[PDB]
Each structure stands twice: as structure tokens, then as C-alpha cells.
Design goal:
Belongs to the internalin family. With 291 residues, the chain is mainly β. It has 2 domains: 215 residues, Ribonuclease Inhibitor (Leucine-rich repeat, LRR (right-handed beta-alpha superhelix), Alpha-Beta Horseshoe); 76 residues, Immunoglobulin-like (Sandwich), CATH 2.60.40. The protein contains 3 helices and 17 strands.
Length: 291
């Protein structure tokens, strides 16, 4: 059963258990109490299945350890950083923590019933701790600082994955995730779709607004940039529109460059069909120039 350290044996005022008054108030509401000064029993705490507390200025969930049966936690738009108090919530199934600053993800390591996790807009770069959640079904990681998604190769139960608005170029870790149905990858740095070829169960796929930044090359009148953009079959994607009246002579994008232009670009576009999913693979390759 629960740890004695995580159980109350006497009626205890809410405010003494939940150190952050915002979270204490949340519990008071959940339990329909008049005030955080009111006592609660463990039986009352055990009855909490779901906490909805978005946009509540919560800085700490200290005390939540006393809620062994909580399965759903909606905590979007708060001021959380540390999620250690969640560690032993073995029944947690849904955890929404968008718009916080949660980075220490190994506190989730023993949440083996967690099926849906949302951590959008947390400033996260390191998702390695997610390796301990192989049962995950939905994962939302939009608007973060992620580059390395290596660990996602272990999340073979995901059917929904959002990685939009990160800094990802290497999507090879996704290649074996054939259970995927909804995959959101817009606003990354993706130029090569080979990784997606086998995702036969996709229904929704977003691949637009990629930004691909090349290392600077020398400014010269006859400028050449090799096209590196690849479709799911490995073939080059012909540029859509090339800046500065440039042209494409496969495989090279070419410009007759003016002295006063110091960066060129091209937009690429490829319609993608993978199983039922139809997607716009779209982006821009930017080529800064140096003297």
C-alpha cells in the first residue's frame, strides 16, 4: 500500500498538507470545503480522481503525494518547475502541464499507467527521461527546444505525437513507430522525409513551415547551393520558388547574384501521401553569404 510518509492518520488542515496556497485552494475546491483551514481525512484524499487546475498560479504540487488514486491532472498554465511530488502517483493516466517550466522528467519514471502526457511550451530540450514511459499513447511536446528525439524510438505504443515548433532535423528515431496515427512535425528543421516512409497507419501528418539553415558560403556572382531536400523515397524535392530570380538545374540551385544581395533562399514543397495521411511538406532553405 501507500507509504506511511504519504498517508495522513488524523484529520489534517488542507493548508498544512499542500504548501502552495494556490494548490491548497485547488484541493479545498475539489473536496467542496469552505476553506483551506478545514481538515481533510485520508479517505477524502483517496476519493480524488481528477484535478482540474489550469491557470491557477500553482508553483508547487507538494502534498499531492497523499492522493494515491488520482488518474487525471490538468495543470496547464501554472508556474511549476519541480514535479518530484508526482513520482509515486502510480495510477496517473493523463498529465497536462503545458505552459510551465518543468524539465526534470525523470520524476515520471515510475508512472507506468501514464497514457497521455502534455508538456508544450516548457522550454524543454532533454526528453531522455521519457524512455521510462513505453506505454505512452499520446505525447504533446510542441513549442519546446528539442533537438534529440532518439528516445522516442522506444515509445512504440504512441498513436499521437506532437513535436511541432522544436529544432528537430533528425527524425530517424520515428521510423519504427508504425502505430502512429497523428504526427505533428511542423516548424522544425526537417529536410529529409526518408524516416517516415513506413508509417503506414498515419491519418494526420503536419510537415509545413520547416526552416533549414545552411552554413555560410562565399558570396560570388555565380552562386550554387546543392538541393538536399528529400522525399520519403529519398528523391530530391524540386524547389518551389527560388529567391532572386534563381533557377534549378538538378541537383543545384543557381543564382546570378548581385553585389548587394547577401543571403538567398528557396522554398520547397512536396505533397506527401503515407497510407491515409495527406500532408504538405513545406519549408525554406536559407543560405547566408560571407565575403
Amino acid at each position: 500500500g501507500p507509504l506511511g510518509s504519504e498517508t495522513i492518520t488524523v484529520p489534517t488542515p488542507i493548508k498544512q498538507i499542500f504548501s502552495d496556497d494556490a494548490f491548497a485552494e485547488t484541493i479545498k475546491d475539489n473536496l467542496k470545503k469552505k476553506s483551506v483551514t478545514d481538515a481533510v481525512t485520508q479517505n477524502e484524499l483517496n476519493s480524488i480522481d481528477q484535478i482540474i487546475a489550469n491557470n491557477s498560479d500553482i508553483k508547487s504540487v507538494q502534498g499531492i503525494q497523499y492522493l494515491p488514486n488520482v488518474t487525471k491532472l490538468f495543470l496547464n498554465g501554472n508556474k511549476l518547475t519541480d514535479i518530484k511530488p508526482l513520482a509515486n502517483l502510480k495510477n496517473l493516466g493523463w498529465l497536462f502541464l503545458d505552459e510551465n517550466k518543468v524539465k526534470d522528467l525523470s520524476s515520471l519514471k515510475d508512472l507506468k499507467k501514464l497514457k497521455s502526457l502534455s508538456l508544450e511550451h516548457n522550454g524543454i530540450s532533454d526528453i531522455n527521461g521519457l524512455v521510462h514511459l513505453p506505454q505512452l499513447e499520446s505525447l504533446y511536446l510542441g513549442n519546446n527546444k528539442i533537438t534529440d528525439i532518439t528516445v522516442l524510438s522506444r515509445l512504440t505504443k504512441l498513436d499521437t505525437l506532437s513535436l511541432e515548433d522544436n529544432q528537430i532535423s533528425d527524425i530517424v528515431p520515428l521510423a519504427g513507430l508504425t502505430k502512429l496515427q497523428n504526427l505533428y512535425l511542423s516548424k522544425n528543421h526537417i529536410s529529409d522525409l526518408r524516416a517516415l516512409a513506413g508509417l503506414k497507419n498515419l491519418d494526420v501528418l503536419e510537415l509545413f513551415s520547416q526552416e533549414c539553415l545552411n552554413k555560410p558560403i562565399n558570396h560570388q556572382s555565380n552562386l550554387v547551393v546543392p538541393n538536399t531536400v528529400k522525399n520519403t523515397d529519398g528523391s530530391l524535392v524540386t524547389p518551389e520558388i527560388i529567391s532572386d530570380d534563381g533557377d534549378y538545374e538538378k541537383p543545384n540551385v543557381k543564382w546570378h547574384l548581385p553585389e548587394f544581395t547577401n543571403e538567398v533562399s528557396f522554398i520547397f514543397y512536396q505533397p506527401v501521401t503515407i497510407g491515409k495521411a495527406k500532408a504538405r511538406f513545406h519549408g525554406r532553405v536559407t543560405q547566408p553569404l560571407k565575403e
